């Protein structure tokens, strides 16, 4: 579309690769550093989609 269709999403970060045919979605907050990210996002805490 001219204005851009933004209803298609794909993951960016994941700790481990997924085995064949794994489908069940998940939208938690992926932590980057050893500091445990909880709830909201910030430094070294990114949305994975």
């Amino acid at each position, epitope marked *: 579309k001219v204005s851009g269709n933004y209803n298609y999403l794909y993951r*960016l*970060f994941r700790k481990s690769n997924l085995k064949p045919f794994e489908r069940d979605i998940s939208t938690e907050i992926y932590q*980057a*550093g*050893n*500091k445990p990210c909880n709830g909201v996002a*910030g*430094f*070294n805490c*990114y*949305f994975p989609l």
Partner: antibody
Amino acid sequence: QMQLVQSGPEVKKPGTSVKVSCKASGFTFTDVSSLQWVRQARGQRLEWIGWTVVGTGNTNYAPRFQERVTITTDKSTSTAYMELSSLRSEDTAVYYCAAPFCSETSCSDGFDLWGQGTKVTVS
Amino acid sequence: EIVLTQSPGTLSLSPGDRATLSCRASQSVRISYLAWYQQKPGQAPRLLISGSSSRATGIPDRFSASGSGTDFTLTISRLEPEDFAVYYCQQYANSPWTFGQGTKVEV
């Protein structure tokens, strides 16, 4: 080595546009690495401008520099650009970009890589 | 918008002793989102301490960070002549980040 290099000083007339870019040598920004930009005047403190995430593309800006500065990232060369317009006399300072090393898995909670900054002056 | 204040304004202690500096904020604080930086004259600042237990490459054991509440402190076991520089406190967790004001340590 794995390290970040910065451009050189320059003098720009007021009421014009200024572009700044800092490079990385032997180091890629992958999808998790992020970097921030800071400015240091002469005999002054440090003020934070903004930091962006290479992967998601989210950007953050200081409230007083909401329109003055625009920050962008480049995956192809793994670098960061700033564009500024109508520079004033207080802008004559040294600009640094600081990032932590990070390789697709995890990384430190502090900025340990640093450049040497660009000395920008207005005359 | 959180403001960071460092104390004392200046430090004048002879080399070979233990030194202490402090920085405090106003809003809420987190243990591992505060970092301490030093800046040599004419050189860009380099990471010293972050998270109160982590260290950068080649950081000597003399550096230490203390504090759990709003007030945080930096302790130096043994000073050496060219360690004299300006120290800055930086925060991550809160609203758009702000640095400190700088503390000059001298003889």
